[PDB]
Enzyme design. Structure first.
Site, short mmCIF file in Angstrom:
data_model
loop_
_atom_site.label_atom_id
_atom_site.label_comp_id
_atom_site.label_asym_id
_atom_site.label_seq_id
_atom_site.Cartn_x
_atom_site.Cartn_y
_atom_site.Cartn_z
CB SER A 124 34.01 43.59 34.09
OG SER A 124 35.29 43.18 33.65
C1 LIG Z 1 35.37 41.86 33.36
O1 LIG Z 1 34.73 40.99 33.83
C2 LIG Z 1 36.71 41.60 32.53
N1 LIG Z 1 37.01 40.19 32.68
C3 LIG Z 1 38.38 39.85 32.84
O2 LIG Z 1 39.26 40.68 32.79
C4 LIG Z 1 38.63 38.39 33.08
N2 LIG Z 1 39.71 38.44 33.99
C5 LIG Z 1 39.79 37.46 34.98
O3 LIG Z 1 39.05 36.47 35.10
N3 LIG Z 1 40.91 37.67 35.87
C6 LIG Z 1 41.04 36.58 36.98
C7 LIG Z 1 41.75 36.89 38.06
N4 LIG Z 1 42.86 38.05 38.02
C8 LIG Z 1 43.83 38.12 39.12
C9 LIG Z 1 43.06 38.66 40.36
C10 LIG Z 1 42.81 38.85 37.03
O4 LIG Z 1 43.54 39.76 36.91
C11 LIG Z 1 41.76 38.69 35.90
O5 LIG Z 1 41.75 39.59 35.14
C12 LIG Z 1 38.81 37.58 31.79
C13 LIG Z 1 39.88 37.85 30.94
C14 LIG Z 1 40.01 37.09 29.77
C15 LIG Z 1 39.06 36.12 29.48
O6 LIG Z 1 39.20 35.38 28.31
C16 LIG Z 1 38.00 35.83 30.36
C17 LIG Z 1 37.89 36.57 31.54
C18 LIG Z 1 36.53 42.11 31.07
N5 LIG Z 1 35.10 41.54 30.71
C19 LIG Z 1 34.84 41.28 29.34
C20 LIG Z 1 33.38 40.83 29.27
O7 LIG Z 1 32.45 41.64 29.48
O8 LIG Z 1 33.06 39.68 29.05
C21 LIG Z 1 35.49 42.15 28.39
C22 LIG Z 1 34.65 42.99 27.32
C23 LIG Z 1 36.86 42.50 28.55
S1 LIG Z 1 37.65 41.74 29.97
#
Ligand SMILES: *C(=O)[C@@H](NC(=O)[C@H](NC(=O)N1CCN(CC)C(=O)C1=O)c1ccc(O)cc1)[C@@H]1N[C@@H](C(=O)O)C(=C)CS1
Length: 324
Positions: free
Chosen positions: A61
């Site tokens: 992110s």
């Molecule tokens: C930013 O870092 C967001 N993190 C995610 O969306 C995480 N997603 C992934 O690890 N993810 C892996 C690989 N793929 C295929 C290429 C994906 O599509 C994917 O999305 C994530 C989602 C759920 C979790 O439980 C953990 C990690 C957002 N970051 C956070 C943050 O800052 O910690 C949020 C406020 C919302 S998601």
């Protein structure tokens, strides 16, 4: 002479070690850059190799401000524009957020960290346009920082991209940067749209930046990123008393034999202050926290808070608002 400020180096080292111990993490790194010169003020790793420069990660992110900047800089998107943020498919792959909103404006995409919303901004551009933009931020490019074993990271040529790859790169998967490259990319936001070189020697000559976005775009993106450290933002743990802080949180699942796993995370927090005219960039990453939470805000936010607040005090920058 080295650009490293020993007082910031000591602070970063203490705060990083406190967080890695508390969260029983595998490793971590802090980078502090001068936001207008690219000089390294502090660079600390857990014991072992110089992971800040040798190791590449999927940014997750913390990549999102860049497609947002590109969309605004093109004139095709306004900050007040609203996007459909429902989950959607590209062939058999899903693009989705952890918390579903039917629609978000650009500020909401930044504040809440919407993978979907960010992908809709990337999708207005061609693969070549987005590759060229990522290349212009230094993704896949040697910094020639002066460190040996410096990673170039990975940016697949756009001629090979599947449509799912353009979407996932916009929210930080399918490309890789070192933490030092990611802190460097943020100089596009802090140095009025110009990418700075990075160096650990004291500068004698004004670094020559490369223009990536308009100064007006950089200013608008810095204003949007303050939402991340205010009420409703994912990065409220990184708020610094007496300042407005522009920042971005990221929590990324790690890749284990080519599959993303849900029990292994990298937590990243990057930001700059004072938001309107920043003096420093602070970048924190902690690899595989296993105790007391795994989300960016709870693991890396407190490290960022202490290192940023401490750095501003060390450099003699006054609070821009009364303390609380
Ligand atoms: C930013 O870092 C967001 N993190 C995610 O969306 C995480 N997603 C992934 O690890 N993810 C892996 C690989 N793929 C295929 C290429 C994906 O599509 C994917 O999305 C994530 C989602 C759920 C979790 O439980 C953990 C990690 C957002 N970051 C956070 C943050 O800052 O910690 C949020 C406020 C919302 S998601």
């Amino acid at each position: 002479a080295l650009s490293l400020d020993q007082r910031i180096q000591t602070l970063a080292y203490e705060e990083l070690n406190k967080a890695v111990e508390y969260h029983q993490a595998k490793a971590g790194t802090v980078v502090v850059l001068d936001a207008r010169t690219g000089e390294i003020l502090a660079l600390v790793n857990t014991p072992g190799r110089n992971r800040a420069v040798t190791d590449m990660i999927e940014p997750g992110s913390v990549m999102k401000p860049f497609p947002i900047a590109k969309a605004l800089d093109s004139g095709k998107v306004d900050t007040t524009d609203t996007f459909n943020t429902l989950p959607y498919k590209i062939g058999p792959a899903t693009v989705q957020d952890t918390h579903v909103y039917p629609t978000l404006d650009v500020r909401g995409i930044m504040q809440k960290s919407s993978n979907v919303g960010t992908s809709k901004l990337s999708a207005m551009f061609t693969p070549k346009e987005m590759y060229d933009f990522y290349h212009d931020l230094g993704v896949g490019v040697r910094m020639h920082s002066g460190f040996p074993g410096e990673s170039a990271g990975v940016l697949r040529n756009w001629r090979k991209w599947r449509p799912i790859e353009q979407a996932t790169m916009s929210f930080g998967y399918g490309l890789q940067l070192s933490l030092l490259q990611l802190a460097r990319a943020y100089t596009v936001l802090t140095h009025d749209g110009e990418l700075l070189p990075v160096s650990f020697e004291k500068q004698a000559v004004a670094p020559k930046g490369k223009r990536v976005i308009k100064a007006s775009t950089a200013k608008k993106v810095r204003e949007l990123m303050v939402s991340v450290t205010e009420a409703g933002g994912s990065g409220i743990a990184g708020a610094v008393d007496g300042f407005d802080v522009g920042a971005k949180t990221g929590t990324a699942r790690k890749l284990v034999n080519g599959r993303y796993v849900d029990y292994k995370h990298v937590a990243t927090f990057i930001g700059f202050a004072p938001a309107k005219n920043p003096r420093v960039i602070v970048a924190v990453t902690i690899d595989e926290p296993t105790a007391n939470g795994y989300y960016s805000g709870v693991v890396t936010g407190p490290v960022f808070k202490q290192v940023m607040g401490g750095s501003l005090n060390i450099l003699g920058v006054s609070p821009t608002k009364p303390l609380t």
